């Protein structure tokens, strides 16, 4: 979720995860990715 995402050093994004990151969680009732 957003809290764990940001806490552990990720970013919540609806779009694809940017270059040099990958999906490592979810945010926003499951509709966004946690990228890191």
What are the angstrom distances between the C-alpha of 6 and each of 21, 26, 33? Answer: 14, 11, 11
If one asks whether residue 32 binds Br ion (CB under 5 A), the answer comes out as no
Residues 21, 36: contact at Cβ < 8 Å? yes
Q: How many helices (H) and strands (E) does the chain have?
A: 1, 3
Among 3, 9, 14, 16, binds Br ion (CB under 5 A): 16
Among 3, 7, 12, 14, binds Br ion (CB under 5 A): 12
If one asks whether residue 11 binds Br ion (CB under 5 A), the answer comes out as yes
Site residues, Br ion (CB under 5 A): 4-5, 11-12, 16-17, 25, 34
């Amino acid at each position: 979720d957003h809290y764990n995402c940001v806490s552990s050093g990720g970013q919540c994004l609806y779009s694809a995860c940017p270059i040099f990151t990958k999906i490592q969680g979810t945010c926003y009732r499951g509709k966004a990715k946690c990228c890191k």
